[PDB]
Amino acid sequence: GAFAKLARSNFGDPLPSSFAQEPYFEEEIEAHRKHHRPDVYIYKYNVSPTHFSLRE
Amino acid sequence: PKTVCVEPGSNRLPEALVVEKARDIFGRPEFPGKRVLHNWRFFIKAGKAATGPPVGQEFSKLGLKAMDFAKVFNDRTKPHFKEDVELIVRIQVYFDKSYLFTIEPPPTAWFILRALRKKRRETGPVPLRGHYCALMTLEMAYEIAKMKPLCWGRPEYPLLETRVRRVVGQARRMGVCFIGVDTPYSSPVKDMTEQQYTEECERYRRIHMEQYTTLRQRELEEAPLIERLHRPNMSPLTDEQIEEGLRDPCLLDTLWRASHPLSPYHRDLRERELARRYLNARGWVKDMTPEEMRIVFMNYR
Amino acid sequence: QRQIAEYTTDPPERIMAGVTGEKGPLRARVSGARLGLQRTPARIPWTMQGLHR
Amino acid sequence: QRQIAEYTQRTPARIPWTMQGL
Amino acid sequence: PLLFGYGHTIQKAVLDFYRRAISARSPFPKDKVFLFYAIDHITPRIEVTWLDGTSYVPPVLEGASSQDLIQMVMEEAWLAADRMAAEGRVLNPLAIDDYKWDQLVVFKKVRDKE
Amino acid sequence: DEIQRRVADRTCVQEQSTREVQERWKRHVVP
Amino acid sequence: LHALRPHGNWDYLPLHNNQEQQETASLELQGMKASVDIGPNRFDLNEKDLSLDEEEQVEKARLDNELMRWRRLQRAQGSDYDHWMEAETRRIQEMA
Amino acid sequence: DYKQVYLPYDAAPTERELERERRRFKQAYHGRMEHRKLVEVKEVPLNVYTYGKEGMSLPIAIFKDQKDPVIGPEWTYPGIYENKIAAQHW
Amino acid sequence: ERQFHLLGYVKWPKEIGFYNAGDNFELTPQAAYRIYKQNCDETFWTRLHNEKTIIHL
């Protein structure tokens, strides 16, 4: 509706998209964490202020 | 009775004044390196000053102005040029509709026609007609190839001994017979005999082979970084040559074109690696010289 | 000590040492020391299973 | 005795003028 | 300066990145993009200094493409602009320009093709 | 060994910078 | 229109032939046209410089998966006896 | 047209030698293979000793100040003696 | 068992390693130390191998 108001025209496009036959997603991390995660490890697991995970 | 110069193969480079004028007119402007949209070649007379029909059609199709090209060509080519002389204009138009043109001397066919005084449709191939055209020697071909190098920044490269092969191939395709080839004897000498001329040809041939070998080795060992990236190379690089390559502005475009996977640089590298694998797979010992392996193949079919 | 480090290390090793990706530490860093392939987790997706020449 | 007897940087690129003059 | 003997995908990707940075979206990207040659056999690298002076070095590893380097640089640019806006820096906004008109020409070309 | 032999085909550097050092250490310490 | 035609001021530029002869043409006259007049000089702008949005990426991934499934189904659609014989014959002719 | 600048020799030839050289050069072979047929050459110059050896000015000039280049001796050009043997229709 | 032996994995004694509650192949610290003591000077051994041995210890 924002772009419709910007263009001063009514858009009547039906059925934009269905989800999927098997819609699978991955866990998204914060905009800064997901790229500035430090390689900090303890005995056998990764350690982050927000996540845990198995490390090898 | 007067001879210009008696020296074993010293008349290679043209006159100093004509070489300077050729470096002036036929030059290599600094190419920007942008994406090339079109590559055109035309034949334009330098004496006349007008907008050619084909170049005008090309510029109108591309939406460009032919009058600017005509003006710059008539301001750069009209002086210090003979009357009614053709020149090869190679235009490179980029995706920004910006065009850069270079001027080049007439082709070998034009040179041969001017040297033989034959006009149009006065020559034809032997398998088409059945008879040779006007007889020629392989000395006018040398003088013609003198004025057609690959780059006017270094007129000595490529070698005349290699240019003459292509120009004589073109003349033979045109349908011209020669005295040194296609004929068991050359033009006779009045002051000399046959055996003296034969032994003189032998000694001149061996000394010219020595000169050709040393000049080829020199030119192959000393080559700019652009030539190292565009052509094969097996010699070490000097610090002064590295500095000159860094001074060169086209180094960026040359490096990018060479890094392109389908470049001649990558082609030669893959060929060399394939030859290494070939030697490692079909070599008698480890230190098998490629020449020794070629001799092996020649002796063992 | 510094000379032995710089003499035993490699250019790709010193390049990929301080690098960290979106998935955390690089798989090369995590599984470069493989005490048998029975321990390796094999976390390569089906889209990445293929490898060019 | 026998052996001693035998013994005795970062530079700026040059942009072509067709790209640089503007 | 010299080109590696074996096919150097890293060198190719960095050259493509420089090409796309020269062709990047800016009134005059030549004032911000600079190329340097390292005769000391220094590995090819990129250094982006933001408006606040902070520097980012995208690690160019084996297998990374120019598109990957551009994605990394642009994500870090978004994060850096967010940091600027949070610090209180007044940033120039994105708008329509001649680069966008040329991209519209390319988009119409693609639409007419397929 | 299989890993190293399959990696060395498409490796970056063709020289023996680190592998020769490893072989030297092995030949000096192991036997 | 004849007055205000393009390159019409050239008739008034050259006041005399003396200045035109004194003006020596340089090689820079050929390269001065290889630069755009208004904008900056750019190396290339292709389809690979068109950024994709999230919905465009999803659409492209769905299209690629559909193409994969379509290829997998065409491999079985063309699995006819005569078509397989033709395919193997062409493969033999290509390898030989 | 050709312009005779200097004579390459010192002994003027005779009509009989000129005619015998022209008749000897009038015939030449074509190709080097089994399908080899003798053909006649056209446009034979009236002079053979001073046609394309030394002492002529070939009209291949491109520039105003560039005079018609003079033709030098046979040995002043490198590689011609091996070209006369290897530049054939192999 | 067929899939196990087809993929090519071996049933080691519990003193060496075993598949833990998450079916991950966990290696005994004693086994890791003995593997280190045997493969100290091999060609493939690395700083990461020493780090993982300390991790297991």
DSSP E54-80: -EE-----TT--HHHHHHHHHHHHHHH
- Binary contact (D19, B33; C-beta < 8 A): yes
Contact, B114 vs H60, CB < 8 A?
A: yes
Residue B228's identity, in one-letter code, is R
The two three-digit tokens of residue B219, written as one number: 């030119």
How close is the nearest chain E Cα to the Cα of G42, in Å?
A: 5
Q: What kind and span of H or E run contains B251?
A: helix B251-259
In this structure, what DSSP letter does residue E23 have? Answer: T
Tell me how far CA of residue G76 lies from CA of E33, G70, G82, G83, H24, in angstroms: 53, 10, 13, 11, 76
Count Cβ atoms below 10 Å from residue G54 Cβ, excluding itself. 7
CA D22 centroid distance within chain: 32
- Binary contact (E1, B237; C-beta < 8 A): no
> Tokens 């091999």 belong to which residue?
I42
Phi, psi of B136, rounded to the nearest 5 degrees: -135, 165
Residues of G whose CB is below 8 A from E20: 43, 49
**Resolution of the solved structure (Å):** 3.1
Residues of B whose CB is below 8 A from G44: 34-35, 95
Phi, psi of E32, rounded to the nearest 5 degrees: -115, -25
Phi, psi of I52, rounded to the nearest 5 degrees: -70, -35
- Binary contact (C24, A54; C-beta < 8 A): no
Whole-angstrom distance, CA of residue C2 vs CA of residue C5 = 5
The two three-digit tokens of residue E46, written as one number: 């990129």
Residue pairs between chains E and G whose CB atoms are closer than 8 Å: 32
Half-sphere exposure of C28 (CA within 13 A, CB side): 14
Q: Which chains touch C (3 or more CB pairs under 8 A)?
A: A, E, F, I
Q: Please work out, in degrees rounded to the nearest 5, the angle formed at the alpha carbon of residue B202 by the alpha carbons of B200 and B203.
A: 65
Nearest to I56 by CA among I10, I22, I23, I25: I25
Question: CB distance from C32 to chain A under 8 Å?
Answer: no
Return the axis-axis angle of helices I29-38 and I47-56, rounded to nearest 10°. 150
Q: Are strands I25-27 and C20-21 parallel, antiparallel or unpaired?
A: unpaired
For residue A41, give the 3-state DSSP assignment.
strand
> Tokens 């033989």 belong to which residue?
B116
Whole-angstrom distance, CA of residue H51 vs CA of residue E42 = 63
Contact, H80 vs B142, CB < 8 A?
A: yes
Helical H segments across chain G, by residue range = 17-22, 28-31, 54-77, 81-95
For residue A34, give the 3-state DSSP assignment.
helix
How close is the nearest chain H Cα to the Cα of B151, in Å?
A: 17
- Binary contact (E6, B269; C-beta < 8 A): yes
Contact, E72 vs E57, CB < 8 A?
A: no
Strand pairing partners for E55? E49
Helical H segments across H7-86, by residue range = 15-25, 80-86
Count Cβ atoms below 10 Å from residue B171 Cβ, excluding itself. 24
Tell me how far CA of residue B100 lies from CA of B30, B42, B60, B69, C18, in angstroms: 9, 14, 16, 10, 47
When computed from its CA atoms, the radius of gyration of chain H, rounded to whole angstroms, is: 16
Contact, B120 vs B174, CB < 8 A?
A: no
Whole-angstrom distance, CA of residue G92 vs CA of residue H71 = 61
D/E touch flag: 3 or more CB pairs below 8 Å: yes
Contact, A37 vs C24, CB < 8 A?
A: yes
Tell me how far CA of residue A16 lies from CA of A11, A19, G51, G53, H36, in angstroms: 12, 10, 21, 15, 78
Cβ neighbours of residue F21 closer than 8 Å, sequence gap 6 or more:
C7, C8
Q: Please work out, in degrees rounded to the nearest 5, the angle formed at the alpha carbon of residue F18 by the alpha carbons of F16 and F23.
A: 85
Residue H56's identity, in one-letter code, is M
Instruction: Please tell me the experimental approach by which this structure was elucidated.
Output: cryo-EM
Phi, psi of I26, rounded to the nearest 5 degrees: -90, 135
Count Cβ atoms below 10 Å from residue B268 Cβ, excluding itself. 14
- Binary contact (H83, B165; C-beta < 8 A): yes
The two three-digit tokens of residue H15, written as one number: 């009509």
Residues of I whose CB is below 8 A from A54: 22, 24
For residue H88, with 0-12 CB atoms within 10 Å meaning exposed, 13-18 middle and 19 or more buried, which class applies?
Answer: middle
Whole-angstrom distance, CA of residue E37 vs CA of residue E15 = 12
The two three-digit tokens of residue D2, written as one number: 């026998």
Question: CB distance from G53 to chain E under 8 Å?
Answer: no
Phi, psi of H19, rounded to the nearest 5 degrees: -65, -40
- Binary contact (I24, C41; C-beta < 8 A): yes
Whole-angstrom distance, CA of residue B157 vs CA of residue B212 = 12
Contact, B94 vs B36, CB < 8 A?
A: yes
Cβ neighbours of residue H48 closer than 8 Å, sequence gap 6 or more:
B187, B188, H18, H21, H22, H25
How close is the nearest chain G Cα to the Cα of E97, in Å?
A: 11
Q: What kind and span of H or E run contains C21?
A: strand C20-21
